[PDB]
Symmetry: D2
Subunit: 217 residues, 4 copies
């Protein structure tokens, strides 16, 4: 794909609502698609000003499978989708009743990926790890990719690590849709490592770094 180069730029815009708290997020990043790495800086603006009202980790994974190292042989569903574009839909089912739904569109112009998302979370316990910001980040995960009904699906039981050392379970279910038909890959897995680094006390300013590599199973 002559459209996806070795070095890419990214820009993000998110409109969201968690437990009634409205917010918007802006971000900018840089990435190496073939190497499976990317880093970005985000700014969360709560509708009512003030610090981030919940754990940024519920948003991190929403902020691009094109940033995955795929073996040169295997069909790269994500890379093939450009320049037409892709849409993503993800369900997050947390173990304590909290549920978040997120949907986003990724477009590309030149070396720049524009990511526009909508995020909505409800029913998180007022004192749980999400609302109390007790999480540290996602443990490495192996997302199972399967082809289902012409599109690629991703399923994985992920874990958000907690301050004291515990873990908080989240089931992820995602639909990866392409604007145009692409050559489908075989069922596989994507190993991902995502690290979050708060830049300010409130957590409104934050950095994310991710490394992802696909494995033939």
């Amino acid at each position: 794909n002559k459209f996806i180069g070795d070095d890419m730029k990214m820009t993000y815009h998110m409109d969201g609502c968690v437990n009634g708290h409205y917010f918007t997020v802006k971000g900018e990043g840089n990435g190496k698609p073939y190497e499976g790495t990317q880093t970005s800086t985000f700014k969360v603006t709560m509708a009512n000003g003030g610090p981030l009202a919940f754990s940024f980790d519920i948003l991190s994974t929403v902020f691009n499978r094109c940033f995955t190292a795929y073996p040169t042989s295997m069909p790269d569903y994500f890379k093939q989708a450009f320049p037409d574009g892709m849409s993503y839909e993800r369900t997050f089912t947390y173990e304590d009743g909290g549920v978040a739904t997120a949907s986003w569109e990724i477009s590309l112009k030149g070396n720049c990926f524009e990511h526009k998302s909508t995020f909505h979370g409800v029913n998180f316990p007022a004192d749980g790890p999400v609302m109390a910001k007790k999480t540290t980040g996602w443990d490495p995960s192996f997302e199972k990719m399967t082809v289902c009904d012409g599109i690629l699906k991703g399923d994985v039981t992920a874990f958000l690590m907690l301050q004291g050392g515990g873990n908080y379970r989240c089931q992820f279910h995602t639909s990866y849709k392409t604007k145009k038909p692409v050559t489908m890959p075989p069922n596989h897995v994507v190993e991902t490592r995502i690290a979050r680094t708060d830049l300010d006390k409130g957590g409104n300013s934050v950095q994310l770094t991710e490394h992802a590599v696909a494995h033939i199973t």
Copy 2:
């Protein structure tokens, strides 16, 4: 509650997204809070114009427990919440993988209830009853109300009736929050009947009528 009268008016505004389709909804209605009845007319405007892209039944229940006939003895959690106001958070877990999250705020001025909501649905099968608009409406349901952690929770396994006669299961989980502390009711059930009537072919123009009555259990 001298604040809630025998005849009330309602106005609605919804911002939503289902399977990537953005839309907004406006509505107006009239209701009898003590009698447990209400009727309203809505107008859906898809971001990209055109007919309603999915079943309006996924939105109907989002569009006010104040419209419930409660025995005069029993604490009315909803009526007591005004004029301060209330917030609602509902998770809809559909049997075929579709998930919708919705959150809304209800305020009151004089005899008018203003309802502002956000709705987000993802992962609905492209050919399921929701996206193909194959539903007719919700069967009558008995929502179980329980008090949990200072707020009222609602849980119920509901069924969306289908054109050919079948049914499509949906698990509802809702948090009913009041702006100010109110006298809590005992665990109870709310029997509800909601009827949808399309006013136009596309379904963008639609009427809803609902009857709800609380029962001591």
Copy 3:
């Protein structure tokens, strides 16, 4: 149904396993099918002797919809099933990860119903309400009955009440199968009240009383 009389007797046998603890249960009861009431006494024998290792409430609902007051007009799926017999399959999905599956067969000879069941529970938290026997009984519930694929299904979000006053959620999903085809009823609800009374300290000896009435919806 000349086969189901006004006064019936019941006998029960259950083989079960909960969290690795094997046990058997024997019971005997009396009931009034048309009145929707029944009472029975059970004896639990843990494989390793000793007191009941978990809350009997997880078993109570396993121990006969024939004991439901149905309007004379409405098809009685359960009563019509005899004398041929019926089989039941129920999934119990508890809110804290515990899951129980149960299957049973009911046969009839004269005025006596023989109930043979198998119960299996796993993953209950070692310190949860089930293993610590912190429950008091089920709150009244409204089981939604729907016809699906030639058989009757029952769905309901039930609540087990806890000693201190709290509640523990359980989603029930049941398949009610008849040995022979019967006239199907319309979707309806069954209101049930079940009361448990421990006869001994260990809870191995226990009494159950239930009242159920069907309602056209």
Copy 4:
């Protein structure tokens, strides 16, 4: 662990019930614990004689993490558990409503592992892949192992491959308990490949081969 040798033998006994169909299973196998491999032959005897009434794949994973290649550095929760023994509890939540619960105990005498299990499945659609025996086997999976409340938990979204090429989703949740306290490992993943080979037309006679390797994450 001088107790677990390079070559081990295995014997199995299972008592089960799926959709009302009672059965028992006997088996014998050989394995290489340090190499992470094992092979066994099983014989299913349906209570009512006749061919296997459902897909053997729902049972395969029930039939020993000791057969996993663990890096010599990392604590091997399973190997350390012997000779005292271990107990397992697994919940299988299938995508089409079928649910199976299974619990088993593994003991060791000399070079022989004795595996005694109980399996119970209910609510599988009469025409689904399980009851119609339309599955071919499990796709390779990465089970996430986490330490929770003194015991090891396993969570994974697995997929049963279907005859025509499709896949059928199953969420697995397992508790791995040891008779005696052992040194806990860090959160990790176990990559497993299990292959089923029917030895007879009915599928009552079947062979299983599995390869598992643990990975530090």
